[PDB]
């Protein structure tokens, strides 16, 4: 459950947040496969509650009504079509599995679901699955309100409602089987793994019992004995009774300290500086690298809806964001996930975005298609960070330097650092308020290299900065603190 199951050479997955299945299928063929992306995190593919007040928010998808593959992203046929086409070009699909709960208890009964399924939160009836009052933790939760009230009590965190979401009794074999039935349907369709949403709110043992019921990956695309990739969403920062290490036996875990600390370092908050990143990784108290799923931001915290809070960097902070993503993709620690978002009208009031609920670009609730502009950027308000030259090229950089050791580190005791990956890559950063101009040892073979941040290597020449590495491996780098992108990266494949 620890291996991503990506094909040899591809080292990152991208979260195509709220994208339609048909757009993802196309993206796999026209961009993801050609550019070397390993896979895609898709939004929950199962039927959810259609919420109209506010108008179709992104979070309505974390509020399940049934396990029918029918949502605003498409129907079951379109979903299957997407998985098949993506797999055919070597790009894996990972499903966001919302299995800790069903919808909010206050939600009105009726057929206001993305597929018309009937449900009644009040009486605990979800006939489409089916689930009844016997399948929820109502009688088990001991809090006066029925919701989680204290996170210092590990029992309550697991058995009570996360902000009202009806909590499934995961210890019952019936419930475990209905969930496995759902997941095995997806595995047999061809998905390579799952993101287990809100794993902190589930007992490690209940998760294990469910995973024991899972099939091996589809033998038409994967080698026999392939187990699904499992990454657990567990927000573990400062001391809480629950630790992310309690979930290592089930698969990988999201390391939220990664994005939070990288954000404060790049923003230079609290007197932190890039020179401190010398021992980035486990040395900073993070989980072991082989159990970590890392990222700069995710769909929750990019809109202040989660762990990391104010320090989190997003596409809104373009310049610093690219630098953070650059550092992440170049550093050997963990398995990396790139974010791909959509724009929403941020409107801050007293320090809080009152429009953090806004769902994906749409026309009367119907999600808009991702349009590709002549310069490969996207239209219809999709940000497509994964298409930004700076990020796309660093995704490739990671593939090229895969397996190569962290070495040749340099720092000026402040905010301009550099390091290489074996003899396959080298990257330099200038985050100080003054220019950087120095000759550094790169460990790369002599030659002329194209800087992949400022440009590309297009048929025999570089469209941007060019770096010259001598016989002894040294090379001169000059980065003005005024540069559009204050960092340079070169690798074995950008060499002329
Ligand atoms: C690189 O570009 C120059 C013109 O700027 C041209 O003279 C040269 O032949 C090009 N090299 C290749 C390999 O295309
Ligand atoms: Ca629970």
Curated annotation (Swiss-Prot):
GO terms for molecular function: alpha-amylase activity; calcium ion binding; chloride ion binding. GO terms for cellular component: extracellular exosome; extracellular region; extracellular space. The record marks 300 as: Transition state stabilizer. Binds 1 Ca(2+) ion per subunit. Chloride binds at residues 195, 298, 337. The keyword Transmembrane does not apply. The active site is at 197 (nucleophile), 233 (proton donor). Detected in pancreas (at protein level). Changing residue 197 to A/N: Abolishes activity. Ca(2+) binds at residues 100, 158, 167, 201. Monomer. Binds to the sea anemone inhibitor helianthamide. This is Pancreatic alpha-amylase. It comes from Homo sapiens (Human). The gene is AMY2A.
């Amino acid at each position: 459950q620890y291996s991503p199951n990506t094909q040899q050479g591809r080292t990152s997955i991208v979260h195509l947040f709220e994208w339609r299945w048909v757009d993802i299928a196309l993206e796999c063929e026209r961009y993801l496969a050609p550019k070397g992306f390993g896979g895609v995190q898709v939004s929950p593919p199962n039927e959810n509650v259609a919420i109209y007040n506010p108008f179709r928010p992104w979070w309505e998808r974390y509020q399940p009504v049934s396990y029918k593959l029918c949502t605003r992203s498409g129907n079951e046929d379109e979903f299957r079509n997407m998985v098949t086409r993506c797999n055919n070009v070597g790009v894996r699909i990972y499903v966001d599995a919302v299995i800790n709960h069903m919808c909010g208890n206050a939600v009105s009964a009726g057929t206001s679901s993305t597929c018309g399924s009937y449900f009644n939160p009040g009486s605990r009836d979800f006939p489409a699955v089916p689930y009844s009052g016997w399948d929820f933790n109502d009688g088990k939760c001991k809090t006066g309100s029925g919701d989680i009230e204290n996170y210092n009590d590990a029992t309550q965190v697991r058995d009570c409602r996360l902000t009202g979401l009806l909590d499934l009794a995961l210890e019952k074999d019936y419930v475990r089987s209905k969930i496995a039935e759902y997941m095995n349907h997806l595995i047999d369709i061809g998905v390579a793994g799952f993101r287990l949403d809100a794993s902190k709110h589930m007992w490690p043992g209940d998760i294990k019992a469910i995973l024991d019921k899972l099939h091996n990956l589809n033998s038409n695309w994967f080698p026999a004995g392939s187990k699904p990739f499992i990454y657990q969403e567990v927000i573990d920062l400062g001391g809480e009774p629950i630790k992310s290490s309690d979930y290592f036996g089930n698969g990988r875990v999201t390391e939220f300290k990664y994005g939070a600390k990288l954000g404060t370092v790049i923003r230079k908050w609290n007197g932190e500086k890039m020179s401190y990143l010398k021992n980035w990784g486990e040395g900073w108290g993070f989980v072991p690298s082989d159990r970590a799923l890392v990222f700069v931001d995710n769909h929750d915290n990019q809109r202040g809806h989660g762990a990391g809070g104010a320090s989190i960097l997003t596409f809104w902070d373009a310049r610093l964001y690219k630098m953070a993503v650059g550092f992440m993709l170049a550093h050997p620690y963990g398995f990396t996930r790139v974010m791909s978002s959509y724009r929403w009208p941020r409107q801050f009031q007293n320090g809080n975005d009152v429009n953090d609920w806004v769902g994906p670009p749409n026309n009367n609730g119907v999600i808009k298609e991702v349009t590709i502009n002549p310069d490969t950027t996207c239209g219809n308000d999709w940000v497509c960070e994964h298409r930004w030259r700076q990020i796309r090229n660093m995704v490739i950089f990671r593939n090229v330097v895969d397996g190569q050791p962290f070495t040749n580190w340099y720092d000026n005791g402040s905010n301009q650092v550099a390091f290489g990956r074996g003899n396959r890559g080298f990257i330099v950063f200038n985050n100080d308020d003054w220019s950087f101009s120095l000759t550094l040892q790169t460990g790369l073979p002599a030659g002329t290299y194209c800087d992949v941040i400022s440009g590309d290597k297009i048929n025999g020449n570089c469209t941007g900065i060019k770096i010259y590495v001598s016989d002894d491996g040294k090379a001169h780098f000059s980065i003005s603190n005024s540069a559009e992108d204050p960092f340079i990266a070169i690798h074995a494949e950008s060499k002329l």
